[PDB]
């Protein structure tokens, strides 16, 4: 049950996504870039990602671990850095702040999960 629960990350990620949706800094990243509206986005970005898509992937059970979820979130930020590379851009600054917030909060989720894995493997 509760110590080393290998499923506890799911609720922890739901809670973190809730915080992220509350942040004004997430506003550009909540929904997919409108590919019909914004022409050259696909010329630049191979794999779009956004927080609504991550939140639905989680709700759907399609992440095997919090590291898979983290990979998709990191793609949100790497896509922004590629599309909006200037340190002068306020959008760049938003992405930087929100990335730092995410990386701060996800740290403990991943470490806790990996510790759970190691314990269960050791005692299996």
- As to burial, measured by CB atoms within 10 angstroms (0-12 exposed, 13-18 middle, 19+ buried), residue 72 is middle
**Contact with ligand 5QD (CB under 6 A) among 55, 66, 69, 80:** 80
Give the CA distances from residue 16 to residues 1, 11, 36, 47, in Å, rounded to whole numbers and listed in that order: 22, 9, 30, 23
Q: In this structure, what token pair is assigned to residue 111?
A: 């470490």
Considering the complex, state which of residue 6 and residue 82 has its C-beta at the smaller distance from ligand 5QD: 82
CB of 37 to ligand 5QD, least distance (A): 8
**Contact with ligand 5QD (CB under 6 A) among 4, 21, 41, 101:** 41
Q: Does 26 bind ligand 5QD (CB under 6 A)?
A: no
Q: Does 28 bind ligand 5QD (CB under 6 A)?
A: yes
Considering the complex, state which of residue 10 and residue 74 has its C-beta at the smaller distance from ligand 5QD: 74
Quick check: 25 and 101 in contact, CB under 8 A?
Answer: yes
Q: Does 54 bind ligand 5QD (CB under 6 A)?
A: no
Residues that bind ligand 5QD (CB under 6 A): 28-29, 33, 38, 41, 80, 83-84, 91
């Amino acid at each position: 049950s509760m110590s080393y629960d290998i499923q506890a990350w799911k609720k922890q990620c739901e809670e973190l996504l809730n915080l992220i949706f509350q942040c004004e800094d997430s506003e550009p990243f909540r929904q997919p870039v409108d590919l019909l509206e914004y022409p050259d986005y696909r010329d630049i970005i191979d794999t779009p990602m956004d927080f609504a898509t991550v939140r639905e992937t989680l709700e759907a059970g399609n992440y095997e671990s919090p590291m898979e979820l983290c990979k998709d979130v990191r793609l949100i930020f790497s896509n922004s850095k590629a599309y909006t590379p200037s340190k002068r851009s306020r959008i760049y600054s938003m992405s930087l702040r929100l990335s730092a917030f995410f990386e701060e909060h996800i740290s403990s989720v991943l470490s806790d999960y990996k510790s759970a894995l190691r314990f269960h493997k050791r005692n299996t």
